[PDB]
């Protein structure tokens, strides 16, 4: 069937739309070239309907099926508790889109009795109406990016007190069930380090190592009725409470298999037949669905001793090589069986013999050396994105810090030690706000995180290593030099020379903003000072962290 019919209607913007740069006083501090940098706006939505609109056909095998059986085994092994409303309310982002209902995100979250009330009837129609699709709105993606232009993503999802009933019924089960499903081929339990690890580990484990990224195209939009009721009746399996077998039933019926589609100007813009972007089974859907494909297909191709890494839509594959005739040949059957599965490529698959050469999650593996002259491997990506929304952040308040995140995730890498923490620091020592908390998202979950914290957040997820590796790679250091005359970044050597003042200034302010200049700065001094364990680093309750991934699932923890 259709992925998606259209009415003509046009995909609205709720407010203006900036597509260039927004340039304040501290722009050019960070990036010349504002002509490369720029935002996806609905003004673009049209081309991306094109793109995302196709009929999809599906063949279904032996090694499907099997592969199916042995996820529902496992599968019926979770036991998942139901949300209350109250629980199901506090993981409501406090900037999530408010309801059509007479309430918003703040009054879900204080837990005020209109909100309270109208998703209990939400939670009752729920349990008495299995069949009457549920409305969404589709929107635009405001995302920042540098020019290569990308046409605006598209976010399709249902009103506010239909996503808490989602929560309700399902996020205990898209929390926990994908990881007994797929085990260590689950790619949201790790941390960037322990995925390093489970990529190296699994590359040493073959006689003759060989690896692919295989990108689908618009993955959504390949998800058909049948792979969305094949989930839920993996999600079905699990040992749950009446209430929540029948919310999760009549979500799938109303919701996630399809239904109207809506502008935010209450225009019908027609009908959707694939996965919605925005719901809360988005994560755990896509990532069951691609691993049961590209499982099937693995047996199809005959690929020796596989292990798969999957996150969401994101797939990555190690295996034993047969040469680079059998391994090509292998490849193009695996992506026959994908492409009868309905996952065809976007870019075809390239079998790789350098580990470090493998993206996947828009990062690869890379080297460096810790204090000791220890080689050390570290998760990195081209900077070149991060820098983009580094620069709009600057100039412009966002309610996701990508910044924040991004030091976060990727504390080891050469540019954001260098980069990112050089500039955002100073900029919050100029408006003294070092202590005022922001949101970032990582792996799609909203999380409010002091600046100050820093170092111990990064000494607990990468460890103490983070603020002393030195010496990377050559094709590393390249990417990122190549990355900063593209977008007229200044030279490293002018950020060591920034670095040197905000650790000084850091320092000078003694306590956390201290410990901050000490840790995350040490590597701009040549005399580097002696770290040890932070104390207060085992109290931070990072539970929850690297447990599932919940894109357009709109979950603040
Ligand atoms: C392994 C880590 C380091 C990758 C970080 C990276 C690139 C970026 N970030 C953050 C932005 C600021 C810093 C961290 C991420 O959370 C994700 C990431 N976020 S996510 O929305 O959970 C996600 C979704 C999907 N596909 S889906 C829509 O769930 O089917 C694939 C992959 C992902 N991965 C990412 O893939």
Same mark, same amino acid.
């Given at each position: 069937?259709?992925?998606?019919?259209?009415?003509?209607?046009?995909?609205?913007?709720?407010?203006?739309?900036?597509?260039?740069?927004?340039?304040?006083?501290?722009?050019?501090?960070?990036?010349?070239?504002?002509?490369?940098?720029?935002?996806?706006?609905?003004?673009?939505?049209?081309?991306?309907?094109?793109?995302?609109?196709?009929?999809?056909?599906?063949?279904?095998?032996?090694?499907?099926?099997?592969?199916?059986?042995?996820?529902?085994?496992?599968?019926?092994?979770?036991?998942?508790?139901?949300?209350?409303?109250?629980?199901?309310?506090?993981?409501?982002?406090?900037?999530?889109?408010?309801?059509?209902?007479?309430?918003?995100?703040?009054?879900?979250?204080?837990?005020?009795?209109?909100?309270?009330?109208?998703?209990?009837?939400?939670?009752?129609?729920?349990?008495?109406?299995?069949?009457?699709?549920?409305?969404?709105?589709?929107?635009?993606?405001?995302?920042?990016?540098?020019?290569?232009?990308?046409?605006?993503?598209?976010?399709?999802?249902?009103?506010?007190?239909?996503?808490?009933?989602?929560?309700?019924?399902?996020?205990?089960?898209?929390?926990?069930?994908?990881?007994?499903?797929?085990?260590?081929?689950?790619?949201?339990?790790?941390?960037?380090?322990?995925?390093?690890?489970?990529?190296?580990?699994?590359?040493?484990?073959?006689?003759?190592?060989?690896?692919?990224?295989?990108?689908?195209?618009?993955?959504?939009?390949?998800?058909?009725?049948?792979?969305?009721?094949?989930?839920?009746?993996?999600?079905?399996?699990?040992?749950?409470?009446?209430?929540?077998?029948?919310?999760?039933?009549?979500?799938?019926?109303?919701?996630?298999?399809?239904?109207?589609?809506?502008?935010?100007?209450?225009?019908?813009?027609?009908?959707?037949?694939?996965?919605?972007?925005?719901?809360?089974?988005?994560?755990?859907?896509?990532?069951?669905?691609?691993?049961?494909?590209?499982?099937?297909?693995?047996?199809?191709?005959?690929?020796?001793?596989?292990?798969?890494?999957?996150?969401?839509?994101?797939?990555?594959?190690?295996?034993?090589?047969?040469?680079?005739?059998?391994?090509?040949?292998?490849?193009?059957?695996?992506?026959?069986?994908?492409?009868?599965?309905?996952?065809?490529?976007?870019?075809?698959?390239?079998?790789?013999?350098?580990?470090?050469?493998?993206?996947?999650?828009?990062?690869?593996?890379?080297?460096?050396?810790?204090?000791?002259?220890? =080689? *050390?491997?570290?998760?990195? +990506?081209?900077?070149?994105? %991060?820098?983009? $929304?580094?620069?709009?952040?600057? @100039? !412009?308040?966002?309610?996701?810090?990508?910044?924040?995140?991004?030091?976060?995730?990727?504390?080891?890498?050469?540019?954001?030690?260098?980069?990112?923490?050089?500039?955002?620091?100073?900029?919050?020592?100029?408006?003294?706000?070092?202590?005022?908390?922001?949101?970032?998202?990582?792996?799609?979950?909203?999380?409010?995180?002091?600046?100050?914290?820093?170092?111990?957040?990064?000494?607990?997820?990468?460890?103490?290593?983070?603020?002393?590796?030195?010496?990377?790679?050559?094709?590393?250091?390249? =990417? *990122?030099?190549?990355?900063? +005359?593209?977008?007229?970044? %200044?030279?490293? $050597?002018?950020?060591?020379?920034? @670095? !040197?003042?905000?650790?000084?200034?850091?320092?000078?302010?003694?306590?956390?903003?201290?410990?901050?200049?000490?840790?995350?700065?040490?590597?701009?001094?040549?005399?580097?000072?002696?770290?040890?364990?932070?104390?207060?680093?085992?109290?931070?309750?990072?539970?929850?962290?690297?447990?599932?991934?919940?894109?357009?699932?709109?979950?603040?923890?």
């Amino acid at each position: 069937s259709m992925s998606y019919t259209w009415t003509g209607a046009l995909i609205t913007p709720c407010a203006a739309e900036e597509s260039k740069l927004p340039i304040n006083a501290l722009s050019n501090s960070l990036l010349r070239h504002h002509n490369m940098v720029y935002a996806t706006t609905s003004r673009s939505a049209g081309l991306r309907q094109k793109k995302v609109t196709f009929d999809r056909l599906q063949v279904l095998d032996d090694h499907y099926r099997d592969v199916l059986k042995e996820m529902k085994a496992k599968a019926s092994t979770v036991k998942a508790k139901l949300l209350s409303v109250e629980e199901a309310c506090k993981l409501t982002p406090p900037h999530s889109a408010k309801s059509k209902f007479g309430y918003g995100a703040k009054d879900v979250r204080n837990l005020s009795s209109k909100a309270v009330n109208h998703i209990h009837s939400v939670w009752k129609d729920l349990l008495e109406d299995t069949v009457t699709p549920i409305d969404t709105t589709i929107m635009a993606k405001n995302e920042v990016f540098c020019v290569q232009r990308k046409p605006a993503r598209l976010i399709v999802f249902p009103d506010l007190g239909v996503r808490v009933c989602e929560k309700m019924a399902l996020y205990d089960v898209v929390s926990t069930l994908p990881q007994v499903v797929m085990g260590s081929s689950y790619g949201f339990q790790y941390s960037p380090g322990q995925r390093v690890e489970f990529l190296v580990n699994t590359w040493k484990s073959k006689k003759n190592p060989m690896g692919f990224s295989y990108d689908t195209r618009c993955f959504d939009s390949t998800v058909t009725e049948n792979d969305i009721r094949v989930e839920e009746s993996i999600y079905q399996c699990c040992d749950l409470a009446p209430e929540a077998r029948q919310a999760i039933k009549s979500l799938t019926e109303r919701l996630y298999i399809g239904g109207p589609l809506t502008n935010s100007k209450g225009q019908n813009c027609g009908y959707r037949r694939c996965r919605a972007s925005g719901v809360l089974t988005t994560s755990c859907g896509n990532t069951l669905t691609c691993y049961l494909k590209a499982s099937a297909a693995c047996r199809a191709a005959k690929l020796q001793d596989c292990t798969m890494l999957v996150n969401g839509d994101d797939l990555v594959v190690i295996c034993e090589s047969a040469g680079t005739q059998e391994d090509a040949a292998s490849l193009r059957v695996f992506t026959e069986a994908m492409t009868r599965y309905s996952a065809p490529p976007g870019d075809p698959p390239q079998p790789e013999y350098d580990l470090e050469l493998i993206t996947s999650c828009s990062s690869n593996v890379s080297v460096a050396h810790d204090a000791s002259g220890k =080689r *050390v491997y570290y998760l990195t +990506r081209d900077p070149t994105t %991060p820098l983009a $929304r580094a620069a709009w952040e600057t @100039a !412009r308040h966002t309610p996701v810090n990508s910044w924040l995140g991004n030091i976060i995730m990727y504390a080891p890498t050469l540019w954001a030690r260098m980069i990112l923490m050089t500039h955002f620091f100073s900029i919050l020592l100029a408006q003294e706000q070092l202590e005022k908390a922001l949101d970032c998202q990582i792996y799609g979950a909203c999380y409010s995180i002091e600046p100050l914290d820093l170092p111990q957040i990064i000494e607990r997820l990468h460890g103490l290593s983070a603020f002393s590796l030195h010496s990377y790679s050559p094709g590393e250091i390249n =990417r *990122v030099a190549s990355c900063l +005359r593209k977008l007229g970044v %200044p030279p490293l $050597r002018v950020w060591r020379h920034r @670095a !040197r003042s905000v650790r000084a200034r850091l320092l000078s302010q003694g306590g956390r903003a201290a410990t901050c200049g000490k840790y995350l700065f040490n590597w701009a001094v040549k005399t580097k000072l002696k770290l040890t364990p932070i104390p207060a680093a085992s109290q931070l309750d990072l539970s929850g962290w690297f447990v599932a991934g919940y894109s357009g699932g709109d979950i603040y923890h």
